C-alpha cells in the first residue's frame, strides 16, 4: 500500500555521479611519465602526480568550465528525474484519499 522506490532517487543520483567520476577518471588515470625514474637515490612513494595526472583538472585548458559543465549536467539530470519522481509519487493520494 505504499509506492516504494528501488533504489532511492538519491540512489539514481549517486549512480550518475559515480558514472561521471569514472568517465573523468578514465582520462585522469593515465600514469605520469616518471622522467626522473631513470635517476635513483630516493625510493619515495608515488604522490598523486606519481600515480597519474593528478593536477590535470587544475591544468585544464578552460578553467573550471568543464567541471562546472559536468556538475550542471548532473544537476539537470537529477532535477528531471526528481520532477518525474514527484509527479509519480503524487498518485499516492489516489490510494490513500
Amino acid at each position: 500500500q505504499v509506492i516504494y522506490l528501488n533504489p532511492p532517487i538519491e540512489e539514481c543520483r549517486y549512480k550518475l555521479y559515480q558514472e561521471m567520476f569514472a568517465w573523468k577518471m578514465v582520462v585522469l588515470s593515465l600514469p605520469r611519465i616518471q622522467s626522473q625514474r631513470y635517476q635513483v637515490g630516493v625510493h619515495y612513494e608515488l604522490t598523486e602526480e606519481e600515480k597519474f595526472y593528478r593536477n590535470a583538472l587544475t591544468r585544464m585548458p578552460d578553467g573550471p568550465v568543464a567541471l562546472e559543465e559536468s556538475y550542471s549536467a548532473v544537476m539537470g539530470i537529477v532535477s528531471e528525474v526528481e520532477q518525474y519522481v514527484k509527479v509519480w509519487l503524487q498518485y499516492q493520494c489516489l490510494w490513500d484519499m
Binding site: 549517486y14 587544475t58 567541471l67 490513500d96
Partner: protein, 324 residues
C-alpha cells in the same frame, strides 16, 4: 486555474492523510563535510556509511548515508556531499548545498595528525571558504538572523546528559550546526615519538581545537578509522542533530583518543581548566609552538646543468684571444 487549486487541494488532503507517514524523516538532510585534501575524508565517511570505497577522484562526492531509523521502524537516505581539497575547485559547492537546503544542512571539518596545527589552519581556511559560500548566497537577512537565533538557542539548550552570552561563542555564527571530526587519531604514538608532539603539547592542541570549535560555536569529536573511536556514536550524534534521533550519549572528556564533547559539556572556564594543564606551553601558545615539518625527499633541483651560449663564449674567447 481553479481546477489546479482543486487538484492541489486534493494533494493537501493527501498530505493530511500522510500523517500515517508524516515525520518519518525530513527528506533532504544533506550534510556537507568540507575541509582540506589528503585526510582521506572519503574513507572516514565511507566507514560511517558502513560501505567501503576509496575511488573518490577530484571534485564533488555524493555518498548516500542510509539512516536506519529503527525507532520509527523506517529508513532515510542522507546526502553526504563531500568536496575535495582544491581551492581551485571551490566553484563546486553551488552544485550540491544551496540556500533551499541551507537550513537543512550540517557542516563538518576533518583533521589529520601529521600537521595538526596546520590542519587547524587548513580547517580555518576551509571554514572561511564555507563562510564566503554562505555569504554569496545572500538571502533575506532577517531569515538568516532568525536561523542564527534558533541555532544560538539550541546551543544554550544543551542540557547536561545526566543566560549570558559567551565572549566569542559562535564568533562564526553561521546559524547551521557544525561538527569537526578529529580524524587520524591512530597516530597518537607517532606524534609522541616520531613527531615528538609532547603530552602538554597534545593537550594544548586539543584545547586549541576546542577553542576553534567554540569560536565557530561548534563541537569536536576525536576518532580514527582503525581505532573505531565513537564511529557509531558519531552516527548517532549526526542523526540526533539532523534527523532528530533521540540522543543519549553522555560527555566523555577524560581520555584523549575519542574526546567527543558536544556543546554545553565545556564552557570557556572549563576549557581553561583543561587548558590549565598546559604548563610548559603558554595558555596563549600559537599553532607553531609545537608544529614540525622537515623538508624531506630533496625534490630534484639538480643545479641546472647548462653551459655558455655560443655567441657569449665566442665573445669571451675572442677577448681571451685578444689577450692571448
Amino acid at each position: 486555474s481553479e481546477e489546479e487549486e482543486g487538484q492541489s487541494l486534493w494533494s493537501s488532503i493527501l498530505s493530511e492523510v500522510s500523517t500515517r507517514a508524516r515525520s518519518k524523516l525530513p527528506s533532504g538532510k544533506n550534510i556537507l563535510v568540507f575541509g582540506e585534501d589528503g585526510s582521506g575524508k572519503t574513507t572516514l565517511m565511507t566507514k560511517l556509511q558502513g560501505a567501503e570505497h576509496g575511488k573518490k577522484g577530484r571534485g564533488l562526492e555524493y555518498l548516500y548515508l542510509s539512516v536506519h531509523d529503527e525507532d520509527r521502524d523506517d529508513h532515510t537516505r542522507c546526502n553526504v556531499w563531500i568536496l575535495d581539497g582544491d581551492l581551485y575547485h571551490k566553484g563546486l559547492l553551488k552544485f550540491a548545498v544551496s540556500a533551499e537546503s541551507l537550513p537543512e544542512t550540517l557542516v563538518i571539518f576533518v583533521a589529520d595528525m601529521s600537521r595538526p596545527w596546520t590542519v587547524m589552519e587548513s580547517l580555518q581556511k576551509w571554514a572561511s571558504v564555507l563562510r564566503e559560500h554562505i555569504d554569496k548566497m545572500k538571502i533575506p537577512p532577517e531569515k538568516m538572523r532568525e536561523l542564527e537565533r534558533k541555532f544560538v538557542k539550541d546551543f544554550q539548550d544543551y542540557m547536561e546528559p545526566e543566560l549570558p552570552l559567551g565572549d566569542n561563542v559562535l564568533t562564526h555564527n553561521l546559524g547551521i550546526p557544525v561538527l569537526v571530526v578529529c580524524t587520524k587519531c591512530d597516530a597518537v604514538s607517532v606524534l609522541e615519538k616520531e613527531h615528538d608532539y609532547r603530552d602538554e603539547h597534545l593537550d594544548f592542541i586539543q584545547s586549541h581545537l576546542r577553542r576553534f570549535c567554540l569560536q565557530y560555536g561548534a563541537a569536536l569529536i576525536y576518532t580514527s578509522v582503525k581505532e573505531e573511536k565513537n564511529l557509531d556514536l558519531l552516527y548517532k550524534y549526526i542523526v540526533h542533530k539532523t534527523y532528530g534521533f533521540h540522543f543519549t550519549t553522555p560527555a566523555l572528556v577524560v581520555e584523549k583518543d575519542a574526546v567527543f564533547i558536544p556543546a554545553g559539556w565545556d564552557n570557556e572556564k572549563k576549557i581553561a581548566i583543561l587548558h590549565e594543564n598546559f604548563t610548559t606551553v603558554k595558555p596563549e601558545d600559537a599553532y607553531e609552538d609545537f608544529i614540525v615539518k622537515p623538508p624531506v625527499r630533496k625534490l630534484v633541483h639538480d643545479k641546472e646543468l647548462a653551459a655558455e651560449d655560443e655567441q657569449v663564449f665566442l665573445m669571451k674567447q675572442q677577448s681571451l684571444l685578444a689577450k692571448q
